[PDB]
Write a protein that binds this ligand. Structure first.
Ligand SMILES: CCCCCCCC(=O)OC[C@H](COP(=O)(O)O[C@@H]1[C@H](O)[C@H](O)[C@@H](OP(=O)(O)O)[C@H](OP(=O)(O)O)[C@H]1O)OC(=O)CCCCCCC
Ligand SMILES: CCCCCCCCCCCCCCCC
Ligand SMILES: CCCCCCCCCCCC
Ligand SMILES: CCCCCCCC
Ligand SMILES: CCCCCCCC
Ligand SMILES: CCCCCCCC
Ligand SMILES: CCCCC
Ligand SMILES: CCCCC
Ligand SMILES: [K+]
Ligand SMILES: [K+]
Lengths: 252, 268
């Protein structure tokens, strides 16, 4: 009977309202600075070259904006990079199909590839989960000879994982923009702003396991939310119980 | 037995790996078969438009013109109208577009059109995602269960009107046909019709719908209503992709048992 979705709905809406105000607070500042300096770089280009004119420069921008729809891409390996992005639902967004048959294929290629790749990621998950189980069975015998012990183990998970899958692969995949790269990619958000050939056979496997790593990390963070959702549910429960108490005694 | 079923798993994992590898190799060759032609045709005609602009204006900096195009394309990484017409513009981080952006992050859609440039907006986005993705996950799950029982109500009436003198196992297929039927109407067809006029051709809307809901990437009822279309459409493909995955387990068995017999016999 109890819906309980509406409350989670408003939390998400409110999370998004807070997120919005925080993003425009952080980004609309540089947006002005950058775009005041873009108006400068036209008027510096127009003044420094009387050869090109006002009416003719927009004809260049249009044909650049037309070239945005296109840009060797689609080579033997770049289309397989593209194909990986589709089934992983990463989809960096840099290259997309333009032919009507490439879209109809991409629709079928996704509807079949996403579940298929899901089974691969699931197997790599269980594969990697027992490998981690091997590493903690030894560690949970050396200094254990137990309810709070389970926290020390989860500290070493986030520690050893954010080394292999966040810190280290900065080389494989500045200091911040690497962690930013890693998180946006492995959360499958789609890392658009940035993106030897024998490189991608090993890199795409660090992706395959890093995807399994954040898949677990995201699920733990979700499990911490079920916990904190109950603590906040019971806390409000008490403070309503005593305020009702209080309102009753004060009236007498 | 405890590390013997793991031997049985790794075999199944490595085979799924190769299936994925082939699936990507096949997909690659099919995309480059379809898209390499469009590229070269447009790529040759974009070199023409350079060498027509260079001859038409000898007194522009021939060598430094690409240095202009780069700095324009570098500015394209931000939302820009760098034109002498309307040197004044709008913000892509306004009150509602950042709330568009935020949703794309928690849904992991993240169209990639606008990304944060401030290192404080990146550090926030990392934390905002690591917390928002699980949070939104519970909403999508609740919307799923919410929508699933609504479907259960609609199929309990339909699986009693057609009860003639019946087989329980075969009726379950008629129900999954009417699911994909209503679903691709409300969540694929009707929006593709609406997203055809407002914004596109007939195909490019369904392409838009699929790419979005697979999470790849004055009475104005748009973002409170469209993104609630998204919220439920995401729950819809989440089920659809899961059935397609369930269809694959079935087909994975049947092909694995069929190869089993044809290995065993080899035509007597
Ligand atoms: C980023 C941090 C966000 C923290 C979010 C934390 C706030 C938040 O998320 O709300 C949760 C709560 C209602 O949600 P609620 O806890 O009842 O959700 C239930 C809960 O998850 C239980 O596990 C299950 O039921 P039960 O209980 O075992 O029977 C069931 O889950 P499942 O069956 O589907 O598996 C759900 O019915 O609402 C308030 O806290 C009241 C004050 C509003 C506070 C809002 C403003 C603080
Ligand atoms: C014992 C409590 C520790 C909990 C771990 C909190 C990690 C928060 C991650 C925030 C990411 C900041 C990235 C900054 C990189 C320059
Ligand atoms: C895109 C579909 C490719 C089909 C690949 C089938 C592989 C069959 C392997 C059978 C092993 C049991
Ligand atoms: C243009 C129609 C696409 C239908 C794809 C169906 C794949 C199961
Ligand atoms: C460098 C400033 C980032 C701090 C983000 C604060 C979000 C609550
Ligand atoms: C296109 C159908 C996929 C077949 C894969 C079978 C799994 C072994
Ligand atoms: C942004 C989460 C604080 C409680 C709603
Ligand atoms: C990072 C604060 C979110 C509320 C738990
Ligand atoms: K995604
Ligand atoms: K994505």
């Amino acid at each position: 009977k109890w819906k309980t979705v509406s409350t989670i709905f408003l939390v998400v809406v409110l999370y998004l309202i807070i997120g919005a105000t925080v993003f425009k607070a952080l980004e609309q500042p540089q947006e002005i600075s950058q775009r005041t300096t873009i108006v400068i770089q036209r008027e510096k280009f127009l003044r420094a070259h009387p050869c090109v004119s006002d009416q003719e420069l927009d004809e260049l921008i249009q044909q650049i904006v037309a070239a945005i729809n296109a840009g060797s891409h689609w080579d033997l390996g770049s289309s397989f990079f593209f194909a990986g992005t589709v089934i992983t639902t990463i989809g960096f967004g840099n290259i997309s199909p333009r032919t009507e048959g490439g879209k109809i294929f991409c629709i079928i290629y996704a509807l079949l590839g996403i579940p298929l790749f899901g089974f691969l990621l699931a197997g790599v998950g269980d594969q990697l989960g027992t490998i981690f189980g091997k590493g903690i069975a030894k560690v949970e015998d050396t200094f254990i000879k137990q309810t709070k012990i389970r926290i020390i183990s989860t500290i070493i998970f986030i520690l050893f994982g954010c080394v292999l899958f966040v810190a280290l692969p900065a080389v494989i995949f500045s200091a911040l923009d690497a962690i930013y790269f890693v998180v946006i990619t492995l959360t499958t958000i789609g890392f658009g702003d940035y993106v030897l050939d024998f490189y991608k056979p090993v890199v795409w496997f660090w992706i395959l396991v890093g995807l399994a790593y954040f898949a677990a990390v995201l699920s733990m963070i979700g499990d911490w939310l079920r916990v904190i959702a109950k603590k906040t549910k019971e806390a409000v429960g008490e403070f309503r119980a005593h305020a009702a108490e209080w309102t009753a005694n004060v009236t007498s």
